[PDB]
Design a protein around this ligand. Structure first.
Ligand code: BEF
Ligand SMILES: [Mg+2]
Length: 1011
């Protein structure tokens, strides 16, 4: 979208120093609204002529950053892209002027190289072509990524807690908080360091010069417009260059997955110089391995570099990764608003209570601050981390070496997973199916089967045909051959010599000679068309075009073979004289070679299990459409009235054609690029039912992932390595199943190449999310009940014992908050998903329901003691209010502890998708021990309340009533928690519509209305 620029470098060196010195404290409110902050300090409004400080306007692009330029030609760095200053009309553009030179192609064709006349300025403007992530902020993570406000509030509460004694509690909470924040810095920095090491290329590449000068220069000094020479052996390509002469052969192993070599461009011209937007074969991609290059009539092969930098395929992924994105983070505003609106009256209420008792003005405010800080606890991230560590440790047991505590629960409610077919949907390496290289005319279907089981010259012909596919062909047949071969058992054969590949014509002729029993002959292979048209006098083509179309329609690779018997003397003469034209012209059709692209047998059960839980399975790959549809039919997950489409980028007006094979559609790269613009009127109608995404460039994968995230979807794209690097961070779940190459950084990293891990990782994420939600609910309820307990304790104007409270808090943190998250998911596959977004009726129908019960059970116990002959504690007369061990405080503390115990016991729920309740034996024994010690703290008259100062009372009849009340509460809490499991009233009221959002459901229901 459009963006405006403005200039305001400086006015004068005046009050700016004082402003900078003053603004050191209020930076917390200064950071928000940068535009107002920079406009309130200085504003030298003028035209952009020599302005260093620029501000991005908020006219259409609703964001803001900071920019700093350097004077060397005015330029700066902004998300990798560099802007070029032009004085012709005083405006800023990108590096697209010289590249888009669609005029006077003669000078482009005459580019042969430069030495020293046009290098300094080019190096000054373009600069280094290397890719490096800066590590400037090595200290500065504290000031960069720690400007959230669970840390400012934590620091504010630290001083308030340090005002009192609070030794052990503060010592524990600071030690806990300083470890996670220190480990996060190392975790963040290791990713950047390994990315910097992985993205590096420093090698010496020769550059030809006019006049006959050759020397070795580094790859750092490389600018567009120069000529690069290609060595015969072939190395790596550091920049996106283009061939100008000769013929070369390369494979797009890291660009499209398949290692299928493709012919290069041609010498004839007539169009523009490069035309990268309208040319695909002519464009030579970089970052790929070169197998072999062919020379020409010239002295050597030369290449021309027309564009390099972050705009190429290598830099596109890097730019996509370091770009900011447009749950688990929007659910805190409601909670903080609720606590604020619940505690606004609490402060004034407590002030009113304190004002009645004539509280001194010394500790009047510390009590209010403690009350404010007690209804919100600084341990929620700690609880989340300690709940997550168990799942993280269990995940690593199955060979999954991933570190992402905050990403485990994100992918719990996965809706669809984007698969890829290069190594994760098909067995690595090309295997041999039933091959039957029969004769030509008078053919019969006979008979696809494992090779070399029958006997005959075909076995020897296939064995002698050779040059990662040759090794597999030799090994996967059973008969081991490279100079001599036995276990025929009869009529042994051996090879003597072979001929190299010829790039001009696809021919592979191998000469064999066995003078023992049979006669020597020659075997050749090549394209089926060549052997069909070159064998007319011997094998006339009869009914040959009917099977070729069917074989090619399935994406199978077909290569034919041929042979011609010859006498011994000419055969040996041809073998020794290194000739090839003496055997061509008249041969006999040997047959054809057929390959198979079948998927792994274990993938089908996983696909079937994934399709019965209303989870979509989309296919994303860069192969041809025929291979994609063949793989889809082979998997057989679904195919109701499959429809095929073809690009129509020929006229401004266009229409989608209708062709034959609750429906699915196939989309391609150019098809997706043409259907967009307009996006909102053509993409939503096809992005829901489409399931085929073949023949798409890797750069479009990032755009597709970004667009899918805006539709409230849950992407589950899994990478393989060196194929999809940019589409790994903006997605929800990213799993790498190979050590090379994108496995250095990923949301999930595993050492397994099977799809069976997806269901178990999904179940683990769901269980972790459920445990985290339960823990958060328990902590919120405990905070609320502590708040009301403290509020009701202000009637007598007393304070709880610091030692007992500290001990009980430590016990709760080390016993309940730890062993609670030990539950795991069962070995079953559920239908529904754990529902988050705790702002609905079924989730909010328990908070107040438990709160009213707690308030009633506290009020009854507090008001029941009025019928007992006890003396009034010293509270209104002269006494020490710091410590008052009276009966009321003791009974209130006992009731609060019992409430904590019952909440910790009855916090559990159902959801049988996880492990059953009677499984966590350590949790059960810990609860039993807690109950036993709680009973013994007040039952036995033994010496235990000495340092506790509990004021033990010789009570005889009140203990029975207390036990009856606690048993009634125990039998009531379970009933309250179990009667609300059903949601029949929820569906009795919400009909027919139930959701006020998620427009995808509305689209689905309006689409199924007419079908
Ligand atoms: F088939 Be791939 F690796 F996109
Ligand atoms: Mg792959």
């Amino acid at each position: 979208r459009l963006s405006g620029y403005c200039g305001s470098p400086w006015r004068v060196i005046g009050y700016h120093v004082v402003v900078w010195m003053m603004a050191g404290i209020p930076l917390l409110l200064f950071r928000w609204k940068p535009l107002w902050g920079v406009r309130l300090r200085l504003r030298p409004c003028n035209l952009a002529h020599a302005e260093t400080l620029v501000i991005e306007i908020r006219d259409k692009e609703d964001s803001s950053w900071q920019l700093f330029t350097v004077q060397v030609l005015r330029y700066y760095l902004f998300q990798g892209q560099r802007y070029i200053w032009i004085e012709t009309q005083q405006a800023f553009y990108q590096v697209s002027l010289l590249d888009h030179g669609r005029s006077c192609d003669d000078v482009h064709r005459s580019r042969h190289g430069l030495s020293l006349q046009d290098q300094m300025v080019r190096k000054a403007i373009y600069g280094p072509n290397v890719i490096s992530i800066p590590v400037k902020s090595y200290p500065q993570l504290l000031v960069d990524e720690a400007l959230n406000p669970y840390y400012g509030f934590q620091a504010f509460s630290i001083a308030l807690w340090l005002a009192d004694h609070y030794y052990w509690y503060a010592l524990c909470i600071f030690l806990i908080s300083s470890i996670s924040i220190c480990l996060s810095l190392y975790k963040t920095r290791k990713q950047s360091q390994t990315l910097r090491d992985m993205v590096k290329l420093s090698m010496r590449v020769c550059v030809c010069r006019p006049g006959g000068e050759e020397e070795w220069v580094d790859s750092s000094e490389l600018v567009p417009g120069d000529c690069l020479v290609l060595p015969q052996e072939g190395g790596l390509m550091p920049c996106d260059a283009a061939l100008v002469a000769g013929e070369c052969m390369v494979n797009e192993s890291s660009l499209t997955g398949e290692s299928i070599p493709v012919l290069k461009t041609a010498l004839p011209e007539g169009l523009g110089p490069y035309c990268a937007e309208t040319h695909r074969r002519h464009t030579l991609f970089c970052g790929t391995l070169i197998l072999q290059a062919r020379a020409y009539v010239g002295p050597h092969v030369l290449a021309v570099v027309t564009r390099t930098g972050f705009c190429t395929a290598k830099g596109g992924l890097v730019s996509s990764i370091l770009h900011p994105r447009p749950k688990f983070y929007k659910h805190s505003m409601k909670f903080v608003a609720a606590l604020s609106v619940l505690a606004l009256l609490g402060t004034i209420y407590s002030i009113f209570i304190l004002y009645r008792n004539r509280v001194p003005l010394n500790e009047i405010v510390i009590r209010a601050l403690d009350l404010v800080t007690v209804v919100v606890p600084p341990a929620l991230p700690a609880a989340m981390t300690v709940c997550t560590l168990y799942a993280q440790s269990r995940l690593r047991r199955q060979g999954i070496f991933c570190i992402h505590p905050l990403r485990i629960n994100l992918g719990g409610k996965l809706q669809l997973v984007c698969f890829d077919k290069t190594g994760t949907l098909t067995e690595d390496g090309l295997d041999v199916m039933g091959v039957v290289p029969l004769k030509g005319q008078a053919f019969l279907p006979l008979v696809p089967e494992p090779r070399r089981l029958p006997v005959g010259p075909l076995l020897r012909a296939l064995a002698t045909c050779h040059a990662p596919m040759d090794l597999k062909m030799v090994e996967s047949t059973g008969w081991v051959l490279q100079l001599q071969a036995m276990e025929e058992p009869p009529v042994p054969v051996s090879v003597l010599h072979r001929f190299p590949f010829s790039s001009a014509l696809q021919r592979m002729s191998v000469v064999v000679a066995w003078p023992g029993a049979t006669q020597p002959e020659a075997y050749v292979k090549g394209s089926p068309e060549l052997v069909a048209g070159l064998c007319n006098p011997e094998t006339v083509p009869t009914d040959f075009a009917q099977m070729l179309q069917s074989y090619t329609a399935a994406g199978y690779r077909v290569v034919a073979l041929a042979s011609k018997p010859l006498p011994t003397v000419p055969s040996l003469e041809a073998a020794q004289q290194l000739t090839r034209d003496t055997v061509e012209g008249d041969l006999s059709l040997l047959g054809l070679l057929v390959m198979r692209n079948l998927l792994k047998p274990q993938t089908t059960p996983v696909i079937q299990a994934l399709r019965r839980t209303r989870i979509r399975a989309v296919m994303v790959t860069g192969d041809n459409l025929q291979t994609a549809v063949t793989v889809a039919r082979g998997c057989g997950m679904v195919a109701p009235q499959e429809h095929l489409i073809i690009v129509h980028a020929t006229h401004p007006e266009r229409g989608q054609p209708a062709s034959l094979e609750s429906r699915h559609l196939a989309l391609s790269g150019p098809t997706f690029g043409i259907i967009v613009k307009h996006f909102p009127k053509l993409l939503p109608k096809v992005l829901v039912q489409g399931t085929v995404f073949a023949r798409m460039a890797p750069e479009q994968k990032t755009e597709l992932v970004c667009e899918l995230q805006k539709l409230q979807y849950c992407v589950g794209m899994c990478g393989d390595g060196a194929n999809d690097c940019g589409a790994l961070k903006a997605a929800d779940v990213g799993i790498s199943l190979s050590q090379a190459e994108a496995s250095v950084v990923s949301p999930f990293t595993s050492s397994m190449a099977s799809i069976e891990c997806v269901p178990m990782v999904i179940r683990e994420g769901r269980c972790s999310l459920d445990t985290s939600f339960s823990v958060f609910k328990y902590m919120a309820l405990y905070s609320l009940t502590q708040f009301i307990s403290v509020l009701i304790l202000y009637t007598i104007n007393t304070n709880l014992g610091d030692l007992q409270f500290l001990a009980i808090d430590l016990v709760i943190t080390t016993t309940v908050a730890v062993l609670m998250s030990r539950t795991g998911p069962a070995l079953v596959l559920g239908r529904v998903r754990p529902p988050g977004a705790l702002l609905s009726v079924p989730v909010l129908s328990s908070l107040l329901l438990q709160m009213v019960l707690v308030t009633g059970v506290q009020l009854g116990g507090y008001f029941l003691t009025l019928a007992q002959p006890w003396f009034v504690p010293l509270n209104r007369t002269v006494a020490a209010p710091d410590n008052l061990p009276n009966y009321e405080n003791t009974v209130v503390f006992s009731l609060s502890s019992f409430q904590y115990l019952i909440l910790a016991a009855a916090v559990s729920k159902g959801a049988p998708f996880r492990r059953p309740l009677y499984t966590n034996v350590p949790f059960l024994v810990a609860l039993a021990l807690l109950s036993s010690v709680l009973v013994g703290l007040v039952l036995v008259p033994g010496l235990l309340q000495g340092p506790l100062a509990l004021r033990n009372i010789t009570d005889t009849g009140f203990k029975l009533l207390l036990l009856g009340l606690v048993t009634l509460n125990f039998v009531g809490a379970f009933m309250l928690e179990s009667v609300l499991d059903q949601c029949l009233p929820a569906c009795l009221r919400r009909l027919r519509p139930k959701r006020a959002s998620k427009k995808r459901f509305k689209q689905l229901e309006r689409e199924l209305a007419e079908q």
